[PDB]
Amino acid sequence: SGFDDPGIFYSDSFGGGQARKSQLQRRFKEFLRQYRVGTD
Amino acid sequence: VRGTPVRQRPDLGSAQKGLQVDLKLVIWGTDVNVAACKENFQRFLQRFIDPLAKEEENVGIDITEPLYMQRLGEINVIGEPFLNVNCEHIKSFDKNLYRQLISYPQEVIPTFDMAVNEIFFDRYPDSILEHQIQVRPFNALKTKNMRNLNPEDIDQLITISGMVIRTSQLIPEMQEAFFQCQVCAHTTRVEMDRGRIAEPSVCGRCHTTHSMALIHNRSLFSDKQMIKLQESPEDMPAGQTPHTVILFAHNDLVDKVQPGDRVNVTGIYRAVPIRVNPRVSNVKSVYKTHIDVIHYRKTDAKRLHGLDEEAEQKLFSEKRVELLKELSRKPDIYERLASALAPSIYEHEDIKKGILLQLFGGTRKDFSHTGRGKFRAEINILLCGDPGTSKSQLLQYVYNLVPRGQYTSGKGSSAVGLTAYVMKDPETRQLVLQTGALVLSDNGICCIDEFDKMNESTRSVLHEVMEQQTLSIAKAGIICQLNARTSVLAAANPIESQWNPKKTTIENIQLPHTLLSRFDLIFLMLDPQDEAYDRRLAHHLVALYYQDMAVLKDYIAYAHSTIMPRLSEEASQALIEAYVDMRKIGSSRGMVSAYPRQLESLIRLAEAHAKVRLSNKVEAIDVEEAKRLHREALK
Amino acid sequence: LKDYALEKEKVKKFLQEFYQFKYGNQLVRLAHREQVALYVDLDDVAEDDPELVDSICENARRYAKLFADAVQELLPQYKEREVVNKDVLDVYIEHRLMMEQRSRDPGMVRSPQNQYPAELMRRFELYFQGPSSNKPRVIREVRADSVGKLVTVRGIVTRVSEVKPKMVVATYTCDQCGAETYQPIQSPTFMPLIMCPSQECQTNRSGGRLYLQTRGSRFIKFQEMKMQEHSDQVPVGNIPRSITVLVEGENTRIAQPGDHVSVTGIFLPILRTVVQGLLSETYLEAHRIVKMNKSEYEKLAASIAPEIYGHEDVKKALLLLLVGGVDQSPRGMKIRGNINICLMGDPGVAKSQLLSYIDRLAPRSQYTTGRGSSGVGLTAAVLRDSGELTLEGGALVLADQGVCCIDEFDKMAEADRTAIHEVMEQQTISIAKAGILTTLNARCSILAAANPAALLSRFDLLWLIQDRPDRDNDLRLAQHITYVHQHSLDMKLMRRYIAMCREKQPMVPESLADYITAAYVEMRREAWYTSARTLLAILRLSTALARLRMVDVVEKEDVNEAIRLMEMSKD
Ligand SMILES: Nc1ncnc2c1ncn2[C@@H]1O[C@H](COP(=O)(O)OP(=O)(O)O)[C@@H](O)[C@H]1O
Ligand SMILES: [Mg+2]
Numbered sequence A: 001s002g003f004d005d006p007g008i009f010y011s012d013s014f015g016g017g018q019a020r021k022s023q024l025q026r027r028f029k030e031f032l033r034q035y036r037v038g039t040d
Numbered sequence B: 001v002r003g004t005p006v007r008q009r010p011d012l013g014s015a016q017k018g019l020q021v022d023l024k025l026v027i028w029g030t031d032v033n034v035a036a037c038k039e040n041f042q043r044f045l046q047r048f049i050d051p052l053a054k055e056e057e058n059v060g061i062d063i064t065e066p067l068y069m070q071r072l073g074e075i076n077v078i079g080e081p082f083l084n085v086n087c088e089h090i091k092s093f094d095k096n097l098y099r100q101l102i103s104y105p106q107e108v109i110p111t112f113d114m115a116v117n118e119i120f121f122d123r124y125p126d127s128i129l130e131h132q133i134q135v136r137p138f139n140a141l142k143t144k145n146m147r148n149l150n151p152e153d154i155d156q157l158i159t160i161s162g163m164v165i166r167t168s169q170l171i172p173e174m175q176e177a178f179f180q181c182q183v184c185a186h187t188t189r190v191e192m193d194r195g196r197i198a199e200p201s202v203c204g205r206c207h208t209t210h211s212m213a214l215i216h217n218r219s220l221f222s223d224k225q226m227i228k229l230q231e232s233p234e235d236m237p238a239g240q241t242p243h244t245v246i247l248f249a250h251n252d253l254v255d256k257v258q259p260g261d262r263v264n265v266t267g268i269y270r271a272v273p274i275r276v277n278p279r280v281s282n283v284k285s286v287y288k289t290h291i292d293v294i295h296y297r298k299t300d301a302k303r304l305h306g307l308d309e310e311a312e313q314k315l316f317s318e319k320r321v322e323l324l325k326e327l328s329r330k331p332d333i334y335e336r337l338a339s340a341l342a343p344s345i346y347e348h349e350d351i352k353k354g355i356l357l358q359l360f361g362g363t364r365k366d367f368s369h370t371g372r373g374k375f376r377a378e379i380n381i382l383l384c385g386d387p388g389t390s391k392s393q394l395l396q397y398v399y400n401l402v403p404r405g406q407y408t409s410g411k412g413s414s415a416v417g418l419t420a421y422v423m424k425d426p427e428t429r430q431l432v433l434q435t436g437a438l439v440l441s442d443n444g445i446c447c448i449d450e451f452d453k454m455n456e457s458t459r460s461v462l463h464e465v466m467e468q469q470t471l472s473i474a475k476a477g478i479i480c481q482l483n484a485r486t487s488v489l490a491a492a493n494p495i496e497s498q499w500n501p502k503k504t505t506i507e508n509i510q511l512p513h514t515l516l517s518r519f520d521l522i523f524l525m526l527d528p529q530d531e532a533y534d535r536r537l538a539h540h541l542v543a544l545y546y547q548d549m550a551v552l553k554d555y556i557a558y559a560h561s562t563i564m565p566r567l568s569e570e571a572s573q574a575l576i577e578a579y580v581d582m583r584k585i586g587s588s589r590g591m592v593s594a595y596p597r598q599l600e601s602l603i604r605l606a607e608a609h610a611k612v613r614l615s616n617k618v619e620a621i622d623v624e625e626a627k628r629l630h631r632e633a634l635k
Numbered sequence C: 001l002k003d004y005a006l007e008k009e010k011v012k013k014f015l016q017e018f019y020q021f022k023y024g025n026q027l028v029r030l031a032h033r034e035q036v037a038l039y040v041d042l043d044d045v046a047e048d049d050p051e052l053v054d055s056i057c058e059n060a061r062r063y064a065k066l067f068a069d070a071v072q073e074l075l076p077q078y079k080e081r082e083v084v085n086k087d088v089l090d091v092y093i094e095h096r097l098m099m100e101q102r103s104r105d106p107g108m109v110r111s112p113q114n115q116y117p118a119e120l121m122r123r124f125e126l127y128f129q130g131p132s133s134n135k136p137r138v139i140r141e142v143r144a145d146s147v148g149k150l151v152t153v154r155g156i157v158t159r160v161s162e163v164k165p166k167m168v169v170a171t172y173t174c175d176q177c178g179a180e181t182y183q184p185i186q187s188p189t190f191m192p193l194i195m196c197p198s199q200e201c202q203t204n205r206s207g208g209r210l211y212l213q214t215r216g217s218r219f220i221k222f223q224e225m226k227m228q229e230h231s232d233q234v235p236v237g238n239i240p241r242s243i244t245v246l247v248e249g250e251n252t253r254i255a256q257p258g259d260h261v262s263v264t265g266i267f268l269p270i271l272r273t274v275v276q277g278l279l280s281e282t283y284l285e286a287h288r289i290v291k292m293n294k295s296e297y298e299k300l301a302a303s304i305a306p307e308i309y310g311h312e313d314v315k316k317a318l319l320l321l322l323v324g325g326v327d328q329s330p331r332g333m334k335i336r337g338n339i340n341i342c343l344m345g346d347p348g349v350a351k352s353q354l355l356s357y358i359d360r361l362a363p364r365s366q367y368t369t370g371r372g373s374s375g376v377g378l379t380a381a382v383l384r385d386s387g388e389l390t391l392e393g394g395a396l397v398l399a400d401q402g403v404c405c406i407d408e409f410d411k412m413a414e415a416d417r418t419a420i421h422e423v424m425e426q427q428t429i430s431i432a433k434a435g436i437l438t439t440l441n442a443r444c445s446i447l448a449a450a451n452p453a454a455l456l457s458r459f460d461l462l463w464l465i466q467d468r469p470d471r472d473n474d475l476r477l478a479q480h481i482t483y484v485h486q487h488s489l490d491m492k493l494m495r496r497y498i499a500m501c502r503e504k505q506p507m508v509p510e511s512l513a514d515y516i517t518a519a520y521v522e523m524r525r526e527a528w529y530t531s532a533r534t535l536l537a538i539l540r541l542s543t544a545l546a547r548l549r550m551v552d553v554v555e556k557e558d559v560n561e562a563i564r565l566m567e568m569s570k571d
């Protein structure tokens, strides 16, 4: 049974002055998805 | 909260994230809300009066006031911050809160703690406890068999019952490490967090890298205690051997319960992995499991009061005390109790009075100033009788009825196995000294069946305990002296397994005189061929075939509590005269000739009867009854 | 070889469509979680497709994976209501799939190793039961060639560990992120993890520092049991070979020490780690457990060992014990409903054969001669196991509820004699020996045999057999046994009647109180060794005879036959 080793499966981060890089990537994602130019 | 310290809960378990999620805002993995459980238990605290609160069994508990509020009042008048939350009270009140607590203990319990501290400090502003009150939830619905527990109750509060085997030495473990910078002497405490410390790795003052060293004996330690315990399951499937379970006690419950004590144990069932080898940091797939401990219930409805239970003052209501006292004042109390003991067997009045006097036990007294060694205060009985006479059933009944009861039978024993032996504990690997039956019975009873078939190499062990109650193990392991102050209830068959009437008493018994003079009572269980007795016994047995304890145990408990009878002048002169009389009588050979040991026997039996009557002084009635019972027992 | 997507499609259509929807009812029950285990039957799959069955026999493990995942995907369409979430484990799985739905983003693709695995989220288990065509093979003969093959074996049990939680899928949580990573365990050991591969951690460049805990994990009911060759299976002179078997899920707590078992499973290897190669241990992964061949009035007693002649009253008392006197625990003190017999005899009357037949008969039975089982053989002792001082049992504690057929009780060791006296008197065994401090529970019934006082005084029946040579008796017995050699009820039916008979629980009537007391005193006068033990003997035999009649009330006929038996025994 120790012959094989399947991976280490994982999941998402459900729950949970200096910011964090995942938050900053999120801020870039929102900025680049939702930015409006011109006028109505 | 005033500001009292929040001391961590080592027994509940290591901390966790406490992750919460919305479906209002429950805890992840659980159907619990902090707010809901907290409020439900606050309701339970403020409004839960009993449907019935027997004052006799629950002294200090009324039927008028809310139940736990007066408990908080007593926790205010004295300083121990612990509240006995009966899980079955919770079951009657709120089944939902029962489910949440006995499914999710380590998180529901801190909320209960928060609520209790909040209510208590609201009630009493200036009251000062050393730390927060803690709730002890016990008497959860009894699982019968550990071997029938499932892998779904991990970290789920269970309850079982059984006898201890060993309570190993304390083991400190870290809770708040202390670090000091080797260069600049900057200090810092590091709280243990979720199962492992955080070595600071940089000085906070001089910023040197990894100059922070762990000063050991400045740290904070909670204690521990491995407590190996043998289960007494109420379910015994067809071949499940006696299950034994490790109990890790912590800061407040350590050394609260000794070996041989019989306890219900409610506690957190906790799986922990097993390391592959002691130095490699791998582990095993096949975990161990050990119950933690959140509570031990000492009280048992089948046994009698324990030693510390008797010792503690606030144990009986005034009404119960008066009931016991007037029950004593009633003249026939001794024969009523001798009738009560073992209701199944039919009218062994003499033997039952003797066994009762044993259970009450003689008066304890101190000879250190006199330097006469230690005077054995216990009583010892030898049921010498033909095989098949219910002597063995008397042994089983009294063994079950008494706590600190151990049991041996013939040559299912050994000298080292009764005294002690050094073996390696397979959880700590240190060579540790495990006790035997004669040390587990330290302040109780050893019931020995087949006492003739107990080859003299073993009865050599019984000699020392019966003469002086010390048991000196002198062995390469240790050279020490174990207390073994055990009363003895021996059962012996005659030679060839039938009492020959031609042979006299000693000749028939065939045991050493130096042993038979130790037993201060000997009963020759014989069967006269009274046809009336035969008919009555038949009707009794078939009657139980077709087919009080509380007052008895409370009575004995009160007697041990504050009845220590002393000899009177009348009793002493009667003892001297009766000893000379018995010496003259038994001077005829064949029968057990008297001795100064038999003088001590008479004194002890007199003290026991005075204890039964609560006389607080041994009387002529006591010594006369001791003489009468000794003669009629030996005849 | 084949294509396992095709195989999975095959078995999916099969499980949906085969029969009352035979497998469909099982599927919906487990979908609602009214059963936690499932069992494929290769007879039921050879009902239509033999190639798939032969492939399952030859590479069973893979198809086990296929079947279990196929049923896992068949689950939700069979699900019809909201289950009550009976376990905190149910709470976890529901919460997990809920948050997966919450942050699903269904178009968004996720890695091949970012998903809740089947072995975690299944919550059911799937096993097999090999076909009748598959002959159960000898435990010695299951060699390396039969590794991976599906194989059934029949063997006696020797010792069985308890149910401790084996890890299946360890669950780790992080110190910064908050995701929850899995380490699916397979082998006897695993190195823990200390770093979190959650993508939030990979984005942050934070220390993983994840901490294992048991809450979110998936344990399982795991036992390692031992098994031993059948003494008939064994070759001419070799000792019986053993085998280790691994028991999982709803296969746990079936076999028990001493009980014959048939286990159906696959013979998969473990890493051995001194000669080169790549060596490996062998354990049989059980997939169906069936106890077999021991633990599945006048004509009846004569059916008890027809090969013996005479001793009709002995056989009747043996039938009576096998039914067992009524178990009673009135007013705390125990009056056990066991019946204890001794057969003192002249040398050779088939008393040993009677004991052997009772051994083959009773659902729990242990036939012990003098010295093959002495000391620890009869008592319980300590042994290394998760290594630990496992206390396990000898003959009597193995026969905790059954019948110990003790042979040649006269010449037993004196410690064995003492222990047997203890168990007959109180159905416990107290020990305070070198490394043992216990009180075993042994609710056994004793069938002693011996050759010519304590015996008389501690028993319910003693029978002296003196074959006084009578010409006609010996002539008939000689004709009988010669006919036996010449020609060489069924046991299962006999045992079924006994098994049902065990559970009627009569209660004695008041009408017989005068009768029983009168008979007791009259027997005492006829004696004047009899006493209260003999009173209890007649009374127990009366209860057991009422049980044999199956009526719940004892009568005068019962006590009459009891006195008949005891009179015959004494005389
Ligand atoms: N009626 C009978 N039926 C079968 N076998 C018999 C019969 N009578 C005698 N025997 C034989 O007697 C032999 C001895 O029996 P055994 O069990 O050794 O008695 P014991 O051990 O009590 O001396 C057996 O081998 C058995 O074959
Ligand atoms: Mg024999």
Ligand SMILES: [Zn+2]
Pocket: B181, B182, B183, B184, B185, B186, B203, B204, B205, B206, B207, B208, B211
């Ligand atoms: Zn510094």
Ligand SMILES: [Zn+2]
Pocket: C173, C174, C175, C176, C177, C178, C179, C196, C197, C198, C201, C208, C210
């Ligand atoms: Zn992480």
